[PDB]
Structures are given as structure tokens and as C-alpha cells.
Amino acid sequence: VCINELDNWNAPLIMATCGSKGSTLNVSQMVAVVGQQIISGNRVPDGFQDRSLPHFPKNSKTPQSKGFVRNSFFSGLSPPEFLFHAISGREGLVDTA
Amino acid sequence: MLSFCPSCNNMLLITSGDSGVYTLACRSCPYEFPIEGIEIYD
Amino acid sequence: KEAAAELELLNADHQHILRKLKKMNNKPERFMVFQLPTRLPAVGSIRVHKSGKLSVKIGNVVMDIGKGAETTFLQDVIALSIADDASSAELLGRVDGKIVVTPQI
Amino acid sequence: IEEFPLKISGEEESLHVFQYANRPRLVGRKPAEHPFISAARYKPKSHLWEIDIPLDEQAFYNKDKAESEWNGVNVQTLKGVGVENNGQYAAFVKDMQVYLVPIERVAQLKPFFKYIDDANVTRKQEQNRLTGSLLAHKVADEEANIELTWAEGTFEQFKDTIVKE
Amino acid sequence: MIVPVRCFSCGKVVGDKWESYLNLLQEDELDEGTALSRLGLKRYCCRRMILTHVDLIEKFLRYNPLEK
Amino acid sequence: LGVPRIKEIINASKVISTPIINAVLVNDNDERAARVVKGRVEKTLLSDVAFYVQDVYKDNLSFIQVRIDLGTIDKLQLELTIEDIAVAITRASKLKIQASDVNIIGKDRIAINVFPSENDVFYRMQQLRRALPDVVVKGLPDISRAVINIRDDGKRELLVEGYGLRDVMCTDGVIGSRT
Amino acid sequence: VDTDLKKIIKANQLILSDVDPEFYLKYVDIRVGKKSSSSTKDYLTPPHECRLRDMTYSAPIYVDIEYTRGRNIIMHKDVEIGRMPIMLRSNKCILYDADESKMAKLNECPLDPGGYFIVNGTEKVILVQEQLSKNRIIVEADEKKGIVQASVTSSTHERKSKTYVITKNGKIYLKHNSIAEEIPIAIVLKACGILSDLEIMQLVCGNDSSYQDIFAVNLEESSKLDIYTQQQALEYIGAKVKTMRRQKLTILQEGIEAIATTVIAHLTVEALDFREKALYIAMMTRRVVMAMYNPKMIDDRDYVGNKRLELAGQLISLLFEDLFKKFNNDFKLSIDKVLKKPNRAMEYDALLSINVHSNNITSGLNRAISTGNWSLKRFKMERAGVTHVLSRLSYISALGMMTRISSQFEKSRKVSGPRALQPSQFGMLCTADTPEGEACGLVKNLALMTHITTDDEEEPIKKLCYVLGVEDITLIDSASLHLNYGVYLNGTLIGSIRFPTKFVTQFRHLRRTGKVSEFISIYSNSHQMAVHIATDGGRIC
Ligand SMILES: [Zn+2]
Ligand SMILES: [Zn+2]
């Protein structure tokens, strides 16, 4: 529903409609929402005992606590969203080196 | 079995008393007890 | 939920020593064991409150609560005395548990 | 509601605690059945306790086992090493008044087996420095001549800490 | 190090507008925007030369090797 | 699936990581055929049919009797009798203890009769107590587990994770045409 | 240079001789660059001039020694026994709280971070290095063989690591590199002092858990071996020992294992008669027994709380301990050569012969920094690439190197674990700045508001817990761990106070009045059924 409300004669929608670089996933991840940063197939594990970050309660399997960002790159990430994106980025960054 | 000595708190075994009767008696202390045992567990 | 056990079980060891101190008070040839803290101020005592808690206000007035201990004395515990390597082993004999005195801050 | 006054009540002797590890408690009717026969010994400078328990010659004695391998034995030796502590006190109350007694040492009795040493010492033929933890194990069984008269009495002790106040 | 003579993009001489800028900062106390506006330049190019410039030579001349 | 699986084939290793065997069925019956064809496969079901393992001593001999019910066998299909469990105990290991004697009584108890450094009877009882609840009963020994799976159509296909492919292909219920 | 530099000479303060028993040198005082009532080393070489002259930047170590003769005369004399390299901007350099005119007079930039050595003209940096937690328990698992437990000993003279492997059937037997073909743990903790079989069963299994039938195999092999305490039991552990020590070899009947179960081997516990060590190995059993029944209760090596950061102060202390142990050995063997050959007793030259033996405590102390090989003979942790040359690409390059933490790998074949970003370094380590290449994830950086702590005393914290209500371990039954959480002081068990929430609350309230609060911390743990107090620093906060 972001690609349909997106006006024509812009750069990334043309670059996704034509070839070289950019898809609908990249423009939906810039504009609308980034979603579900996964590592090693599943979601992020418990970095501490019974939880991932110390900013969430114990036995909290909510999406905002266990690796689901909800802000797009235009709006800005929260620090748990920033750490969750940094883990999934450094996973793919170390598999190249 | 898992039975313990009331006198020295050690592990008792099953031995043959003079070739033909069974009794539980440790080598830990002078103790013997001629009962039959049960080893039921779920 | 851990604060509930810090107030419910405190109404159990205070009543357990109340069942031990005055109920068996007449004349048992019998000893107990208290855990007093070190660096003692150089006395005051139990001061059973309004059927609530038991809190010692010791002399040298700075104040020192504490009752109750653990069930480590399931085994047999008997005290005894000694002299200068000539006569010993004069037992009194029982323990009926222990109490622990912990200074509040 | 009043209180029950505590006193330090004087300090002139040394106390000790058995704290047995073998016979916890019976099911009822005045439990823990402490024996009478023992009459054991004592050793200082390593603190090396020994205490004894009599055996049952009537039941479960196993007369073949108790006299076949090792010698005809009736003693059952226990062993414990005490360690110094702080803040522990003993208590005895007479109807209004709690008495603190410095007790100063706590040990635990553990049944060390001596007849296996007696059996292995027979079946064999049938240097000034140690620097800690070996000098204590070397100097352990030297004097031992405190074979002691196991006595009782609550009259020489209860009328011993009440006179000063 | 020192203020450049010409700006990089168009080439207007901005080296004549540094001491007169520091004179407007200390005395006749103004903000940087208005005191840099009534000094010449209207475009944001050649305004960036005087705004974002660090003066390293005042710290470099404390290490003079020809004197003591 | 990735680059440690192409190397799994190019090296041609003797043991591999996570094998599967895709077998098919004959009829179109989901529950009953699913349970019986799955039940003809896995092993060491003795920790689900016994409820206890006890060892008593009767004055010269020992009973290691096991209480095998009939309710577990009624739910999931295992075509066996107590004689089949006696044959399974008869070949419980290769050569450890299981040579001399077993017994079969009315209400399904099998007590291993035993006969004699010193006093090895209690040691044999403890080792045979601790080696009994993983003895296989009925099924194939070299298959871990089995999952029956549904395709896009109304067909059911089982799959195991073993190493046989001969005793799996020689199994009543499945067809040996393709696997 | 203020605390540990005095502590080193208090362990080797006196030397002997084989010539006569009436010969001793006594170290009284030590300090760096201070002689008399004048200022602290009135003129050094400046730190800029020694970078152009290809020199080192060092201050001399002044020791004070006692000097005797057979005429029983006793006096003192201050001597210079070698140079020690001074780090920039820390209490001995000229650049300590200097004025901005003082920085320009001495030809130094006032904005460099400092903290780097300038050896042989060039700028070297000792990197911060992470390792696992010393004197603490870690448990790892495996699918193929079984679960393995480790415990790294932090003793000074030797490098021990007491492993607790299993192979099959729950046949638990610990291993060591100084022991032969190993023994199950029933005999081992039977030799330590736990003699009853009733309390070898309750201590590691509980009342009605499923832990009992798992551990009861090791009781069954109790009678398979040297059972029936130490007329057979400790002798079997003493018989299978390595490092035979043929000097006084006749001890191996009763006393070769009392060497092994004490401060020589396996741990850092200094007990004479063993109650804590008999429990610490026995509490090490329960954490494996709980991990056999539940494989989830295992520790991860990559967790940031399981690691310690070793700084530039510990490595220099190790190097100075080694070069001071070597200093007395090369001087004792060179003073007995002269004090034997003539007939008379030599008055002088026993103090005036130290300057030819003080050139290896200087050249080695600079060589191990300039080269990077911290080769110690007794310690056996030979690591290369420790010191690195200070990067001067820009201003942010020389600052981002002083923040850098370099980790060590075991092997570079199947690592796969310590390169991902752990969630436990939130605010502790930098989550962005990592190198791109071979050292991707192996090299990390500190954040802004962090602090790496130090070990303070360890003595008054243990005496403060006993005031707050915990009993000593020699006063509690062996069948009492169904109680509340058991207190651990740096891994060592203290005695399991009741009501641990009030204990944690009062300990944190005492921390907020002054207990000086760099590292002395407390935290509960439910799956371990314990509550930890940490005092031994070397750890971020
Ligand atoms: Zn016994
Ligand atoms: Zn321009």
C-alpha cells in the first residue's frame, strides 16, 4: 500500500520498475516500515537470562522486545531497534569477510 | 536398591550368605539385614 | 512477587521462636544457639511488640533486629565444656534450632 | 508486652559443639537416643576429636564378618576437626532471663574408620621443612594421652555463670 | 590553516572577509548569520568559507623554532 | 542446502549430516494407515509400555519382572504379543548377559532368571537395570524418528531419518516401487 | 607504580647463600624517580626530544637494601637498579596537569590522548585484551561426546585448568594435565573430606528431583575401586600423579596427595583441613548434574559477562615479577663465586657489583615492549602481537586505537561464534566500529561511559556478610540446599543466608553510603539457585 500511493517521476520507484538497482522491498523499507530483523533463520535469542535487552520484562515474547522493528529509515530507529538492526547487519557483514 | 546404612551412612550391597541365602550387608561396618527389597521407579 | 515471602514468612519464624521461648521455659536442662553480630557496641533484648514482630533494641542504643534461622539442625547437636586437658565432655545437651540477629540499616 | 533481658554473663571457660552427622532424628517419643558407653579421648594443637558409639551385639552383628577379617571390635570411632568462629553464643533461660555464653568453636563429627588402618598395617609383611598443610597432617597422632572420664552435671555449670551478677 | 583567497565553487575572493568578520564578532556583538550577511556575500556558497573554517595557524605559531 | 552440502557430495563421505528417506503409501486412509505404518518403524518403545522396572530377591533367585500393559498397544498399532517382547529381550544386545533364561506368565511379566571379583550378582543387577529401559521392542534399529507429511493434494507420505533403505523398502504397508 | 610496585618486592624481599647462613640482603623501600628532599627527578629527558634522538623515555627504579658483615654491622644505602619506561601523562611524566604554555614550551600537542609508550624513538601501545573469567565456573555442552566443565585457576606461580569431562553412562571423572589416567569423583571428593555416602547423594541431587538416578551410577563404582576412606581412597589419587619430584621421593604413601589437593594443584584455596574445597568440587558436580537432565542450563563462551579485560597494568606487573625473579637468581649465582674463593671475608663489592646485573632488567623491559613477545619461562602464556605501533593516520586514528580491544582466537578454522554482535554489550562495547577483513568481530572498541574496574581487597566483604546474617560453611548441615539462595563470594561458597531479597536490598543500601562501589556488586540467579557477590575486578561497568 506504499507503492500504490507513491507518485510517479521519482527516482527509486522508477529504478524498481526498471532494472539496475532497487526493488519494491527497498522502497517499502525506506518509506513504509522495516520489518522482522532475523538472525540464523529464527528471531533473535535471549542475550541475557530469559530476555534479550534489559529494557523489557522477563518472559516477554512481544514483537517490540524480540526483534521486530517498526520504524522506517526515514523516521528513525529506537535504540533497541538500532541494536536489533545492528546484529542482523553484522551477521551478513561477517559472512562476506 | 539405593539403601543406606543406619550406622555409618554408606552404600550396602547384595551378598550371598554361605552359598544359598541372600542378605543385604555392607563391608563398611558389621551390619546385615535379611529382608527382601524393592526397586520400583516410574 | 518476591516481596510477599519477605513479609509472610517473617510472621512464621517470629511465632516459631514464641512457641520455643516461653512455652518451654520452666526447667529443661537444655541449650540453644544465637548468632550475634561482631563489632559489638561497647543489655537490651527482644521486646515482643503488639503481636507483630520481634526486634531487639540492644544497649548502646543503636538498634539490631533479627529472629529466625534455617532447619539445618535436623542432625543431632549437643554442646559440651572443657578444662585444661584433664577433664572435659560434660554435656548439657539439645539445640532446638538457632536464631540469627541481623542489624537493620 | 515486656522483654526478656540478655547478659554476657561472664567468660572464663571454653565451650564446644558436637554437631553429629550420623543419627539425625527418630520418628517420635523423645528422639535421637544418645549413647552412654563412649568414654573417648582428645588431642590439642590439631584439635583432632574422637568420639565413640557402642555396637549392638544382639542384632545385626554379623559374627562372621566382625571377627573374620578385622579384629573383634566393639568401638566405632568418629572424628572431627574444629575451627574458630566469631559471634556464636550459647543460650539458656530461667523463666525471665536469657544468658549468652561465648561458645567460640564449632566442629562436625565424621566416622573415620580405624579398623581398616589396623588391618592394613598388619597385612604389609604378613626433611625439616614442609611449609604449610603438611606439618599439620604430619603432627596429628603424637600425644593422645587424654583418655577421658566422660562426666555430666548441670550443677557445676548453671551455678557458675549466675554468681557474677 | 589560513582562510583561502578564493572560494572553491565560483571563485569570489573571500580572503578579504576574515579580519572584518572577527571584528564584527567581538565588538558590535551580533550572531554569525546577520554579521556575515551585512559583510558582503548573499549566496550560501562563499558563506560556507567563513562559517566552517578552523584557524590552525594561531596554534601552529606557538611552536616557533626561530625564537625562544 | 548450501556450500556444506555440495562438499558433502563431492567428498563422498561415509556418514552424512541429516539424512532423510522419502517413502510412499498404498491406500488413501489417513489416521489408521498413518499410525500403523509409522508404528512399524521406530525403536526403543520400552520406556512407554512398562510403567516401571523393578528387581526383587526371593531367597535364592532374582526377579527383574516388567509390567507390560495392553492399553498403549491398543491406541497406536503395534502387531506384537508378549512373545515378541520376549524375542526382543532375547536379542536385546549382541553378547552382554542375554543368553540363559526368560519366562512368560499370564499377566505379562518377564523375569530374567540369573545364576552366579566376589558378589557379582548385585553388579549384574545394577548393570542390567541401567541397560534395560533403552532395549528395543519392535521397529527398525537404525532410524531415529518418522514424520508423515501432507502434499498439496489429499495424499499422505511418510519420511524417516535413517540409513537402511533395504529394511525400509522391505516393509509391509509401503510399496517398494519408488523411494 | 604506587601499589603493586611495592607488593612485588614484598614476596622476594630476602636472599640467601650456600656459603654461610649469616648472609642476607633485605629490601626496605622502592620508588620510581625519587631520592631526597628535592623535586621528583628534577630533570628527565623530555618526551619530544627522545622521539627524535631514537631514545627511550624512562625513570630509574631506586631500591634500598640492607648490607651486613660478620662484624654484625647494619646500615642502608640507596642504589639505582635500572630504568623503567614512563607512560605519557600519568603521575611520573612531566606532562601531568601542565599549562597550555607548558605544552608548547616542551614541544608537545595538548590534545593527544596519551597513554602510549615511546620506546626506542617509536610509539608503542599495549592493547586491552579480553579473556575468560578467572576463578569462576563455566559450563559448556556438546552433542557428540558429552558436557565438559572448566575452571581456570588464577594462581601466580602455575597455570592450571581443572577440567571435569564425562564420556559415557554418566561415568563422571574429572581430568587434569598433571594427573595420569583419571579417577571418578566419588573417590576424589571422598579424599577431600566428605566421607559418608548419605551426604554424597543429597548434596548433588536434592530431595525429590530426577537428579538422583543420574548421579547414582558413580556410587555404584565406589565399591569397584579404593573405597573406605583414606587408608585406600586418597592413596589411589596419590598413586596416579604426574610430576613425581624424585627429590624426597619416599613421600608417595600418604603425603603426595596432600600436596595435590592443596595450593600446589587444581585451585587457589588455602585450606589446611578441607571443608570448602570438599564442597567447591562437590558444588561443581551439581552444575553438571543439572545440565545432564536439562541441556538448556548451559553457559555460553561469547557472553560479555563471562569475560574479563586485562589492561596495561597487569602485563607490566607480570614482566617485572619475572625480571625481578631473574634479577635475584643471576645475582645470587654471581655473589657466591666471589664469597668462597679467598680466605678473608670481603667487606665491599657485594653492593658495588649490581650495576653489571642491572642491564638485563632494563634491556629486557624495553625489548618485550618494542618487540611484543611477552615470553615468561614459568608462566607459559607466550603471546605475540601484544604491543602495536601507534597509528598516526589522523587525529581520530590515534584516539580510536587507545580504545581498541584485541581478542585472541584458538584456531581460525571453525570459529563461527565470537564474531556476531552479542546483545549483552549494550552500552559496554561499540556496536558499530569493527574492522573489515580477517579481524571482523575479533577486534572491538569501548563506548564512552564505561569503566574497567580493579580488585580491591576481598577481605572486609567476607566479614561484612557474616554481620548481615549468613552462617559459616562449617556450621550448616550437608543436607541443606533446598533452602533459599546460596551466597557466592567470587565463586567461593559462603553459607546460604535465608531471605536473599532483604540481603540484596541491604547490601545495595550499604553500597550507596560507601563500600567503595567500583565493582563490589550483587545479583541473584534462580536457575543456579544462588546469589553472587563480585569483588575481583577486571571487568566493565
Ligand atoms: Zn553402616
Ligand atoms: Zn562561490
Side-chain angles (χ1 to χ4, degrees), chain B residues 4-10 26 28-31, chain D residues 113:
Chain B
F4 290 152
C5 296
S7 179
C8 65
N9 289 319
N10 214 168
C26 65
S28 304
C29 65
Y31 180 76
Chain D
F113 291 159

Side-chain angles (χ1 to χ4, degrees), chain D residues 32-94:
Chain D
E33 54 182 0
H34 186 270
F36 182 75
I37 304 299
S38 297
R41 79 281 297 152
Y42 180 78
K43 289 189 283 183
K45 86 189 290 184
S46 59
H47 296 285
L48 259 289
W49 280 359
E50 291 86 5
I51 204 166
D52 296 330
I53 290 172
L55 272 300
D56 194 0
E57 298 293 330
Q58 183 67 40
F60 55 87
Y61 183 70
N62 207 167
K63 187 257 182 66
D64 195 1
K65 181 68 176 177
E67 284 83 3
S68 179
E69 181 67 29
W70 56 86
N71 197 0
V73 66
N74 201 3
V75 68
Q76 193 267 329
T77 304
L78 284 78
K79 185 178 182 291
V81 175
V83 62
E84 63 182 1
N85 291 315
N86 296 115
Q88 293 299 110
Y89 290 99
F92 64 98
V93 188
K94 55 107 177 182

Side-chain angles (χ1 to χ4, degrees), chain E residues 7-12 43 45-46:
Chain E
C7 178
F8 292 163
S9 299
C10 71
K12 187 173 182 293
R43 295 176 294 168
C45 180
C46 310

